[PDB]
Amino acid sequence: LMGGFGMKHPPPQILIKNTPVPADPPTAFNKDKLNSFITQYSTGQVSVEIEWELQKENSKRWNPEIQYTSNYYKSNNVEFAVNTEGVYSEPRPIGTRYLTRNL
Amino acid sequence: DGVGSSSGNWHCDSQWLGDRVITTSTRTWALPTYNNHLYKQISNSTSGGSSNDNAYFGYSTPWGYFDFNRFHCHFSPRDWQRLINNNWGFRPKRLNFKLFNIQVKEVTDNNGVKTIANNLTSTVQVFTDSDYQLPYVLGSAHEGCLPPFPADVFMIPQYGYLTLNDGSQAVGRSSFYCLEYFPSQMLRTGNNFQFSYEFENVPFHSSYAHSQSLDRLMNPLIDQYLYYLSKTINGSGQNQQTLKFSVAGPSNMAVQGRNYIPGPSYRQQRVSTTVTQNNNSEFAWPGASSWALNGRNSLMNPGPAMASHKEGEDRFFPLSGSLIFGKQGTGRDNVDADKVMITNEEEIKTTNPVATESYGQVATNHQSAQAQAQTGWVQNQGILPGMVWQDRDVYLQGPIWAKIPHTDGNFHPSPLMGGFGMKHPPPQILIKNTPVPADPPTAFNKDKLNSFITQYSTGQVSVEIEWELQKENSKRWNPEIQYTSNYYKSNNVEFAVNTEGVYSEPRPIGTRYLTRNL
Amino acid sequence: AHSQSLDRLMNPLIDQYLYYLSKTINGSGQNQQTLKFSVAGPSNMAVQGRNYIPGPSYRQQRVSTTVTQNNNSEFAWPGASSWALNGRNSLMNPGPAMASHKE
């Protein structure tokens, strides 16, 4: 209902955890579990590539279509570009529907 | 191999085939340094020990060991439910053990602030005792097991043993085992350990109850062709004597003849969970069934497997004859009855005598015209040819196996506590992190180095067991009893984690639900 | 021989996860009754649970090689353990193998 492609078996969840490394155990044995651990974190890179299948416009329309454009008028910033403080901001939501087909 | 490559993957799954189960488990362990790398000759005289029954002598070692032999280590509550509801019996077949992803850490404590650093060159040394040349600790049900919940990190328990003694002194037959005196495998980060083991043939543990008792084996419709002595008295009055006989039949059972008799019994004292019904006195030690060995009275915990109570009376339990488990976070000493988990043995009422009752009754004397027939009570009955019994039941919290002591003879060497007795159980895995000494002095000294680096190690253990199953063949019509989670709403989920992150098992789960014919 | 006894099979360092009934009496005085439990451990052995028990026994009469410590009477035949078969009392020589003396 929100949008997208419903699937019985969507792409699976990737769960990640950094394994616990405990601090020094006491010398005398204790039944209880170890609640003292080393403060720790991890870092890396993820690559996600998707292969998409396209359906090309076959339209026999005469007059020109509507398209999505960046309006030319001058502005303090560039849309879909970084700020002066280094902040990336998307100005407006972009739908998928511009080209037309016959009903 | 190397520092930056992992020694092994985490594999925790369990796969159910038709006749066979394979349960893999993986945990994270932490191994400290024990006894400052020393063997310290522990004995009762070190602290207290003013009673001869409590006298002991032994040695404590820097080594530590893996004890995985409780059931909750290898089974989740769901894999246990799936097991005991669908199957009559089981037994282990193979065992496979792995140590991997070892990490050794140095600790420096200065000015109260402490920095834990990583030693890449340090080793940890581990061996399995395959020839059973060491005192076998595992079968005694001591703490230190792999936690039941896979997310817990557990400490490895210290190894130590006891030998002969007279009081606290050592008798000349006492043995001393140096564990350094065995070949072991030394592992750095990037080394991994493994071994395989095959369980010797053990009879299937029977997970079933009986759908008929031992004293009703009979066709209720038909008479017996054998007689009994019904009437020894002609009538009231003097000199009235006759021998009348009668066909044993459905009208009068319990006088019929039958081919088999219930198992042996050693009576236990009866104590009620209701407070006021118990006596006002201390009967705990004094009124308890014990067995004496060499002047020492060893109280008799779990003895011959016997029905804990009779019929619908659950108020009472045998003093020492039942297993008692603690709940989560239960205190050490003087725990109230509500925090302990008392186990219920009543499933064996059919083949076994009640633990708190006499096995039977025997005639004391010869009767005669002068002498009346007098009968005494049998408190204990050792065995008779033709007896039939069953072993004590298996739980999630209870031990999987034990070691049958090597001796000239043993009768039915099934462990009194529970599980699978074996002459050659799966071997002990002992582990120690090798000593790294601090800076030696410059001038040579004869004495051994007593100054070491504070150090500990960490890693993962994988233990997979291959189990053999005996499937239910039952032709019963009506539905079985099964083990269920009761549906009613509650603040928490049973066999699930708390709000503080604590995992707790609410109740002990026996193995016996399905029934078979006696 | 055996280098360890049957009632010491255990790790002296570690506790048992099984309990026993330690205290049946709340305190001195009337109507004081409670069931207290305790972990069986190195402090109190001989109350621990254990998987095996010692062999069978048929009691024999005790007689001392020191003369004066024995009783003054004839207990040889009368006070001796026997087994009767078909009206005959066969005195029980070497029966179940049992330790001759204690400590």
XYZ file of N, CA, C and O in Angstrom, chain B residues 320-485:
664
model
N 15.977 -37.294 50.655
C 17.138 -37.191 49.786
C 16.954 -37.868 48.436
O 17.875 -37.837 47.616
N 15.803 -38.479 48.179
C 15.668 -39.310 46.998
C 15.243 -38.600 45.734
O 15.048 -39.262 44.711
N 15.098 -37.283 45.767
C 14.653 -36.522 44.611
C 15.721 -35.524 44.194
O 16.539 -35.089 45.007
N 15.710 -35.167 42.915
C 16.565 -34.098 42.431
C 15.926 -32.753 42.736
O 14.721 -32.570 42.561
N 16.736 -31.815 43.210
C 16.281 -30.467 43.513
C 17.101 -29.516 42.659
O 18.336 -29.547 42.702
N 16.427 -28.685 41.880
C 17.085 -27.676 41.071
C 16.761 -26.296 41.626
O 15.727 -26.095 42.261
N 17.663 -25.354 41.410
C 17.404 -23.984 41.781
C 16.832 -23.187 40.625
O 17.086 -23.476 39.461
N 16.056 -22.162 40.966
C 15.562 -21.243 39.958
C 16.645 -20.223 39.631
O 17.745 -20.248 40.184
N 16.339 -19.311 38.720
C 17.332 -18.334 38.306
C 17.577 -17.322 39.416
O 16.639 -16.805 40.028
N 18.851 -17.047 39.680
C 19.196 -16.148 40.757
C 18.894 -16.684 42.134
O 18.651 -15.903 43.056
N 18.891 -18.003 42.296
C 18.607 -18.602 43.590
C 19.829 -18.512 44.491
O 20.966 -18.685 44.045
N 19.591 -18.233 45.767
C 20.674 -18.106 46.719
C 21.455 -19.397 46.875
O 21.091 -20.463 46.387
N 22.586 -19.276 47.566
C 23.434 -20.436 47.803
C 22.930 -21.296 48.957
O 22.838 -22.520 48.830
N 22.607 -20.676 50.089
C 22.344 -21.404 51.321
C 21.050 -20.931 51.963
O 20.673 -19.761 51.853
N 20.389 -21.855 52.659
C 19.134 -21.591 53.357
C 18.117 -20.934 52.430
O 17.543 -19.886 52.728
N 17.907 -21.563 51.304
C 16.944 -21.115 50.313
C 15.570 -21.649 50.689
O 15.432 -22.808 51.092
N 14.551 -20.804 50.565
C 13.190 -21.232 50.846
C 12.720 -22.241 49.804
O 13.263 -22.343 48.703
N 11.685 -22.997 50.173
C 11.201 -24.076 49.321
C 10.632 -23.582 48.001
O 10.575 -24.356 47.041
N 10.206 -22.321 47.922
C 9.609 -21.826 46.688
C 10.653 -21.529 45.622
O 10.350 -21.610 44.427
N 11.874 -21.178 46.022
C 12.908 -20.861 45.050
C 13.597 -22.097 44.487
O 14.226 -22.008 43.428
N 13.522 -23.232 45.171
C 14.038 -24.474 44.607
C 12.989 -25.118 43.706
O 11.784 -24.911 43.851
N 13.469 -25.922 42.766
C 12.637 -26.654 41.819
C 12.744 -28.134 42.163
O 13.777 -28.758 41.907
N 11.682 -28.697 42.721
C 11.686 -30.090 43.154
C 11.162 -30.957 42.019
O 10.162 -30.616 41.378
N 11.829 -32.077 41.768
C 11.509 -32.897 40.612
C 10.525 -34.000 40.986
O 10.496 -34.482 42.122
N 9.680 -34.361 40.026
C 8.570 -35.275 40.254
C 8.821 -36.571 39.499
O 8.888 -36.573 38.266
N 8.960 -37.666 40.241
C 9.352 -38.960 39.703
C 8.158 -39.883 39.443
O 8.352 -41.044 39.078
N 6.928 -39.387 39.604
C 5.754 -40.253 39.676
C 5.473 -41.026 38.394
O 4.562 -41.859 38.379
N 6.192 -40.760 37.310
C 5.894 -41.451 36.060
C 6.166 -42.946 36.144
O 5.610 -43.712 35.352
N 7.009 -43.377 37.083
C 7.433 -44.767 37.203
C 6.605 -45.547 38.216
O 6.985 -46.659 38.580
N 5.503 -44.976 38.714
C 4.672 -45.673 39.692
C 4.326 -47.090 39.263
O 4.066 -47.947 40.112
N 4.307 -47.354 37.957
C 3.864 -48.650 37.460
C 4.869 -49.752 37.780
O 4.507 -50.780 38.357
N 6.131 -49.570 37.396
C 7.148 -50.603 37.572
C 7.965 -50.479 38.851
O 8.688 -51.419 39.187
N 7.872 -49.369 39.573
C 8.760 -49.135 40.696
C 7.981 -48.925 41.982
O 6.868 -48.397 41.962
N 8.533 -49.340 43.114
C 7.884 -49.067 44.395
C 8.090 -47.625 44.818
O 9.039 -46.957 44.413
N 7.162 -47.144 45.646
C 7.258 -45.782 46.149
C 8.490 -45.662 47.030
O 8.819 -46.572 47.800
N 9.188 -44.532 46.909
C 10.451 -44.360 47.619
C 10.263 -44.314 49.125
O 11.138 -44.760 49.869
N 9.142 -43.786 49.597
C 8.928 -43.596 51.023
C 8.206 -44.755 51.687
O 7.928 -44.681 52.885
N 7.900 -45.816 50.950
C 7.140 -46.938 51.477
C 7.946 -48.226 51.439
O 8.879 -48.378 50.648
N 7.558 -49.158 52.306
C 8.208 -50.454 52.364
C 7.980 -51.232 51.075
O 6.926 -51.132 50.443
N 8.978 -52.029 50.693
C 8.831 -52.856 49.507
C 7.714 -53.871 49.657
O 7.138 -54.295 48.653
N 7.399 -54.269 50.880
C 6.496 -55.389 51.071
C 6.477 -55.830 52.512
O 6.717 -55.034 53.425
N 6.166 -57.104 52.704
C 6.016 -57.665 54.033
C 6.425 -59.127 53.972
O 6.169 -59.801 52.974
N 7.085 -59.607 55.025
C 7.542 -60.988 55.102
C 7.132 -61.576 56.438
O 6.996 -60.863 57.436
N 6.956 -62.893 56.456
C 6.665 -63.596 57.694
C 7.900 -63.637 58.578
O 9.017 -63.828 58.099
N 7.710 -63.380 59.867
C 8.813 -63.490 60.812
C 9.023 -64.907 61.335
O 10.167 -65.345 61.476
N 7.948 -65.636 61.636
C 8.041 -66.871 62.403
C 7.235 -67.980 61.742
O 6.487 -67.756 60.789
N 7.416 -69.194 62.257
C 6.538 -70.308 61.932
C 5.306 -70.274 62.824
O 5.421 -70.176 64.049
N 4.130 -70.352 62.213
C 2.907 -70.482 62.984
C 2.785 -71.892 63.550
O 3.437 -72.836 63.099
N 1.928 -72.021 64.551
C 1.554 -73.315 65.097
C 0.257 -73.122 65.862
O -0.278 -72.014 65.933
N -0.250 -74.210 66.443
C -1.443 -74.104 67.272
C -1.261 -73.061 68.367
O -2.202 -72.338 68.712
N -0.054 -72.974 68.928
C 0.233 -71.985 69.960
C 0.586 -70.621 69.374
O 0.140 -69.590 69.888
N 1.382 -70.593 68.306
C 2.014 -69.371 67.826
C 1.214 -68.747 66.691
O 0.873 -69.428 65.719
N 0.933 -67.452 66.810
C 0.249 -66.726 65.751
C 1.218 -66.351 64.639
O 2.423 -66.205 64.855
N 0.675 -66.197 63.436
C 1.488 -65.777 62.305
C 1.838 -64.305 62.440
O 0.956 -63.454 62.580
N 3.131 -64.002 62.401
C 3.628 -62.647 62.579
C 4.469 -62.254 61.374
O 5.284 -63.043 60.890
N 4.262 -61.033 60.892
C 4.923 -60.548 59.692
C 5.600 -59.215 59.969
O 5.010 -58.326 60.591
N 6.844 -59.084 59.507
C 7.579 -57.845 59.605
C 7.639 -57.110 58.273
O 7.287 -57.638 57.224
N 8.111 -55.870 58.338
C 8.168 -54.999 57.173
C 9.529 -55.080 56.502
O 10.561 -55.150 57.172
N 9.524 -55.065 55.175
C 10.753 -55.025 54.397
C 11.046 -53.569 54.079
O 10.350 -52.949 53.272
N 12.082 -53.018 54.706
C 12.440 -51.632 54.439
C 13.266 -51.514 53.168
O 13.032 -50.619 52.352
N 14.225 -52.411 52.982
C 15.042 -52.462 51.782
C 15.000 -53.865 51.201
O 14.994 -54.852 51.939
N 14.959 -53.949 49.876
C 14.994 -55.229 49.182
C 16.011 -55.133 48.063
O 15.845 -54.323 47.150
N 17.058 -55.942 48.133
C 18.126 -55.787 47.177
C 17.802 -56.149 45.745
O 17.855 -55.293 44.862
N 17.470 -57.411 45.487
C 17.019 -57.828 44.168
C 16.364 -59.181 44.355
O 16.543 -59.832 45.374
N 15.582 -59.601 43.372
C 15.149 -60.968 43.312
C 15.116 -61.298 41.833
O 14.815 -60.420 41.017
N 15.447 -62.523 41.449
C 15.289 -62.893 40.045
C 13.821 -62.789 39.679
O 12.954 -63.318 40.374
N 13.544 -62.065 38.605
C 12.188 -61.728 38.248
C 11.766 -60.310 38.563
O 10.615 -59.962 38.296
N 12.647 -59.482 39.119
C 12.312 -58.082 39.336
C 12.385 -57.281 38.050
O 13.138 -57.600 37.131
N 11.603 -56.208 38.009
C 11.558 -55.293 36.881
C 11.451 -53.876 37.422
O 10.647 -53.609 38.320
N 12.268 -52.968 36.892
C 12.293 -51.589 37.353
C 12.530 -50.676 36.159
O 12.693 -51.132 35.025
N 12.552 -49.372 36.419
C 13.029 -48.397 35.449
C 13.986 -47.407 36.086
O 13.958 -47.169 37.294
N 14.832 -46.836 35.239
C 15.842 -45.868 35.618
C 15.221 -44.497 35.867
O 14.104 -44.205 35.445
N 15.961 -43.658 36.582
C 15.507 -42.304 36.849
C 15.497 -41.478 35.569
O 16.282 -41.705 34.648
N 14.574 -40.527 35.516
C 14.272 -39.799 34.298
C 15.328 -38.735 33.992
O 16.095 -38.304 34.855
N 15.346 -38.320 32.728
C 16.264 -37.330 32.175
C 15.552 -35.986 32.078
O 14.352 -35.939 31.797
N 16.290 -34.896 32.310
C 15.757 -33.540 32.285
C 16.593 -32.662 31.355
O 17.602 -33.096 30.803
N 16.167 -31.409 31.180
C 17.027 -30.430 30.518
C 18.204 -30.044 31.396
O 19.321 -29.849 30.905
N 17.972 -29.906 32.692
C 19.008 -29.430 33.587
C 19.924 -30.537 34.083
O 20.924 -30.237 34.736
N 19.615 -31.797 33.794
C 20.342 -32.904 34.359
C 21.486 -33.377 33.490
O 21.593 -33.026 32.316
N 22.352 -34.206 34.056
C 23.555 -34.632 33.342
C 23.262 -35.622 32.229
O 22.338 -36.430 32.307
N 24.077 -35.555 31.179
C 23.868 -36.444 30.044
C 24.448 -37.822 30.309
O 23.824 -38.834 29.988
N 25.647 -37.901 30.877
C 26.309 -39.185 31.048
C 27.019 -39.211 32.390
O 26.893 -38.299 33.210
N 27.772 -40.282 32.599
C 28.646 -40.458 33.749
C 29.709 -41.464 33.348
O 29.673 -42.025 32.251
N 30.653 -41.711 34.245
C 31.697 -42.692 33.999
C 31.500 -43.861 34.942
O 31.462 -43.679 36.161
N 31.371 -45.057 34.380
C 31.245 -46.267 35.179
C 32.620 -46.538 35.773
O 33.582 -46.728 35.018
N 32.770 -46.546 37.096
C 34.094 -46.763 37.680
C 34.678 -48.094 37.238
O 33.959 -49.080 37.075
N 35.991 -48.120 37.024
C 36.639 -49.345 36.581
C 36.838 -50.244 37.786
O 37.623 -49.919 38.681
N 36.160 -51.386 37.787
C 36.068 -52.260 38.947
C 35.751 -53.667 38.469
O 35.375 -53.883 37.316
N 35.926 -54.625 39.379
C 35.691 -56.024 39.040
C 34.256 -56.257 38.611
O 34.002 -56.954 37.623
N 33.303 -55.673 39.319
C 31.917 -55.891 38.970
C 31.058 -54.695 39.291
O 31.384 -53.862 40.139
N 29.947 -54.624 38.574
C 28.929 -53.611 38.761
C 27.617 -54.202 38.286
O 27.595 -55.035 37.380
N 26.527 -53.801 38.916
C 25.222 -54.281 38.500
C 24.438 -53.138 37.890
O 24.214 -52.115 38.545
N 24.019 -53.325 36.647
C 23.190 -52.383 35.919
C 23.801 -50.998 36.054
O 23.256 -50.148 36.765
N 24.922 -50.745 35.424
C 25.678 -49.508 35.667
C 25.046 -48.269 35.043
O 25.699 -47.506 34.337
N 23.784 -48.067 35.313
C 23.145 -46.840 34.870
C 23.183 -45.819 35.994
O 22.827 -46.150 37.128
N 23.613 -44.589 35.717
C 23.869 -43.632 36.797
C 22.627 -43.373 37.628
O 21.532 -43.186 37.101
N 22.813 -43.369 38.950
C 21.687 -43.187 39.856
C 21.041 -41.824 39.691
O 19.842 -41.672 39.947
N 21.818 -40.821 39.294
C 21.264 -39.493 39.073
C 20.527 -39.427 37.744
O 19.403 -38.924 37.666
N 21.147 -39.929 36.692
C 20.496 -40.038 35.404
C 21.523 -40.070 34.302
O 22.708 -39.824 34.511
N 21.043 -40.361 33.108
C 21.885 -40.326 31.942
C 22.431 -41.681 31.548
O 21.936 -42.737 31.941
N 23.484 -41.632 30.747
C 24.038 -42.797 30.078
C 25.377 -43.131 30.717
O 26.347 -42.390 30.550
N 25.445 -44.244 31.437
C 26.716 -44.673 31.983
C 27.604 -45.252 30.897
O 27.151 -45.984 30.019
N 28.887 -44.917 30.959
C 29.843 -45.391 29.972
C 31.174 -45.711 30.625
O 31.661 -44.954 31.465
N 31.757 -46.844 30.232
C 33.102 -47.171 30.685
C 34.100 -46.145 30.180
O 35.052 -45.790 30.883
N 33.901 -45.665 28.962
C 34.793 -44.707 28.320
C 33.949 -43.541 27.840
O 33.591 -43.470 26.660
N 33.603 -42.618 28.725
C 32.786 -41.493 28.322
C 33.597 -40.558 27.449
O 34.801 -40.776 27.260
N 32.988 -39.519 26.892
C 33.755 -38.568 26.117
C 34.804 -37.898 26.980
O 34.526 -37.490 28.117
N 36.022 -37.782 26.471
C 37.156 -37.446 27.326
C 37.090 -36.020 27.829
O 36.377 -35.169 27.298
N 37.848 -35.776 28.888
C 37.968 -34.438 29.432
C 38.845 -33.579 28.542
O 39.898 -34.018 28.080
N 38.414 -32.346 28.309
C 39.209 -31.368 27.583
C 39.720 -30.375 28.609
O 38.945 -29.586 29.154
N 41.018 -30.410 28.879
C 41.633 -29.490 29.819
C 42.361 -28.401 29.054
O 42.961 -28.661 28.012
N 42.306 -27.183 29.579
C 42.866 -26.025 28.900
C 43.563 -25.136 29.919
O 43.097 -24.976 31.049
N 44.703 -24.588 29.520
C 45.512 -23.703 30.340
C 46.182 -22.709 29.415
O 46.582 -23.071 28.308
N 46.319 -21.469 29.863
C 47.100 -20.493 29.119
C 48.522 -20.440 29.663
O 48.734 -20.233 30.858
N 49.487 -20.661 28.776
C 50.858 -20.899 29.185
C 51.426 -19.688 29.914
O 51.110 -18.546 29.581
N 52.273 -19.914 30.913
C 52.798 -18.793 31.690
C 53.779 -17.968 30.882
O 54.620 -18.500 30.160
N 53.648 -16.654 30.999
C 54.640 -15.737 30.459
C 55.241 -14.993 31.642
O 54.539 -14.219 32.305
N 56.510 -15.209 31.958
C 57.088 -14.590 33.146
C 57.411 -13.125 32.934
O 57.665 -12.671 31.818
N 57.401 -12.383 34.034
C 57.878 -11.013 34.010
C 59.397 -11.010 33.865
O 60.038 -12.056 33.767
N 59.979 -9.820 33.857
C 61.405 -9.701 33.592
C 62.218 -10.469 34.630
O 62.040 -10.253 35.834
N 63.087 -11.385 34.214
C 63.960 -12.053 35.164
C 64.986 -11.082 35.710
O 65.321 -10.087 35.052
N 65.500 -11.326 36.908
C 66.637 -10.538 37.388
C 67.880 -10.829 36.567
O 67.977 -11.836 35.863
N 68.842 -9.913 36.651
C 70.044 -10.038 35.836
C 70.933 -11.170 36.336
O 71.358 -12.027 35.556
N 71.228 -11.191 37.629
C 72.051 -12.252 38.188
C 71.252 -13.540 38.287
O 70.092 -13.537 38.708
N 71.881 -14.645 37.898
C 71.215 -15.938 37.915
C 70.817 -16.333 39.327
O 71.551 -16.092 40.289
N 69.643 -16.942 39.447
C 69.134 -17.426 40.719
C 68.585 -18.829 40.523
O 67.950 -19.122 39.509
N 68.840 -19.692 41.506
C 68.406 -21.080 41.423
C 66.889 -21.207 41.461
O 66.327 -22.099 40.817
N 66.219 -20.326 42.196
C 64.802 -20.472 42.485
C 63.966 -20.330 41.216
O 64.384 -19.721 40.229
N 62.772 -20.912 41.250
C 61.854 -20.785 40.130
C 61.205 -19.408 40.136
O 61.105 -18.742 41.170
N 60.757 -18.984 38.961
C 60.222 -17.642 38.791
C 58.774 -17.610 39.256
O 57.922 -18.304 38.692
N 58.493 -16.813 40.282
C 57.144 -16.693 40.816
C 56.396 -15.469 40.307
O 55.251 -15.253 40.709
N 57.009 -14.661 39.450
C 56.396 -13.440 38.949
C 56.006 -13.641 37.493
O 56.857 -13.950 36.655
N 54.725 -13.454 37.198
C 54.174 -13.697 35.877
C 53.338 -12.504 35.448
O 53.023 -11.614 36.241
N 52.983 -12.498 34.175
C 52.132 -11.469 33.601
C 50.677 -11.870 33.793
O 50.298 -13.011 33.513
N 49.860 -10.940 34.288
C 48.429 -11.192 34.401
C 47.821 -11.297 33.010
O 48.044 -10.436 32.158
N 47.066 -12.362 32.777
C 46.745 -12.748 31.414
C 45.480 -13.589 31.424
O 45.152 -14.229 32.425
N 44.768 -13.581 30.302
C 43.612 -14.451 30.135
C 43.343 -14.604 28.651
O 43.866 -13.853 27.831
N 42.530 -15.594 28.311
C 42.253 -15.901 26.921
C 40.756 -16.040 26.698
O 39.966 -16.129 27.637
N 40.373 -16.046 25.425
C 38.979 -16.024 25.017
C 38.876 -16.705 23.661
O 39.843 -16.739 22.903
N 37.709 -17.256 23.364
C 37.522 -17.934 22.100
C 36.108 -18.436 21.968
O 35.207 -17.958 22.654
N 35.912 -19.396 21.072
C 34.619 -20.041 20.904
C 34.767 -21.553 20.862
O 35.748 -22.074 20.334
N 33.780 -22.245 21.427
C 33.689 -23.699 21.402
C 32.489 -24.112 20.573
O 31.397 -23.563 20.732
N 32.686 -25.090 19.700
C 31.600 -25.745 18.991
C 31.545 -27.192 19.437
O 32.550 -27.902 19.367
N 30.380 -27.625 19.898
C 30.169 -28.998 20.324
C 28.944 -29.512 19.593
O 27.829 -29.063 19.868
N 29.133 -30.465 18.691
C 28.010 -31.093 18.014
C 27.942 -32.557 18.406
O 28.962 -33.248 18.417
N 26.745 -33.018 18.736
C 26.509 -34.412 19.065
C 25.526 -34.973 18.056
O 24.607 -34.278 17.614
N 25.733 -36.222 17.679
C 24.846 -36.952 16.791
C 24.057 -37.940 17.634
O 24.643 -38.791 18.309
N 22.741 -37.809 17.616
C 21.854 -38.577 18.468
C 21.096 -39.588 17.627
O 20.798 -39.342 16.459
N 20.785 -40.727 18.225
C 20.010 -41.764 17.563
C 18.637 -41.821 18.208
O 18.529 -41.830 19.434
N 17.595 -41.859 17.389
C 16.225 -41.741 17.858
C 15.480 -43.057 17.699
O 15.770 -43.851 16.804
N 14.508 -43.273 18.578
C 13.605 -44.411 18.498
C 12.188 -43.867 18.388
O 11.657 -43.313 19.353
N 11.572 -44.040 17.226
C 10.322 -43.363 16.931
C 9.142 -44.081 17.581
O 9.163 -45.292 17.807
N 8.093 -43.311 17.858
C 6.861 -43.852 18.419
C 6.163 -44.725 17.379
O 5.892 -44.279 16.258
N 5.922 -45.983 17.726
C 5.180 -46.909 16.885
C 3.730 -47.079 17.327
O 3.017 -47.906 16.759
N 3.289 -46.316 18.329
C 2.085 -46.628 19.095
C 0.843 -46.769 18.224
O 0.623 -45.998 17.291
N 0.042 -47.792 18.532
C -1.251 -48.037 17.908
C -2.413 -47.533 18.764
O -3.564 -47.883 18.503
N -2.117 -46.773 19.815
C -3.117 -46.169 20.689
C -4.166 -45.403 19.892
O -3.884 -44.851 18.825
N -5.393 -45.370 20.414
C -6.481 -44.634 19.773
C -6.580 -43.197 20.277
O -6.348 -42.255 19.522
N -6.920 -43.024 21.552
C -7.115 -41.702 22.125
C -5.813 -40.908 22.107
O -4.736 -41.470 21.910
N -5.884 -39.591 22.297
C -4.674 -38.771 22.203
C -3.750 -38.889 23.408
O -4.180 -39.047 24.550
N -2.454 -38.782 23.121
C -1.377 -38.763 24.100
C -1.397 -37.497 24.950
O -2.038 -36.499 24.620
N -0.678 -37.555 26.062
C -0.248 -36.351 26.763
C 1.019 -35.831 26.102
O 1.881 -36.608 25.683
N 1.136 -34.512 25.995
C 2.296 -33.876 25.395
C 2.781 -32.787 26.340
O 2.119 -32.451 27.323
N 3.957 -32.238 26.059
C 4.440 -31.089 26.808
C 4.061 -29.807 26.082
O 4.353 -29.651 24.893
N 3.422 -28.884 26.798
C 2.941 -27.647 26.207
C 3.353 -26.447 27.035
O 3.598 -26.550 28.239
N 3.404 -25.303 26.367
C 3.384 -24.015 27.039
C 1.932 -23.633 27.274
O 1.159 -23.528 26.318
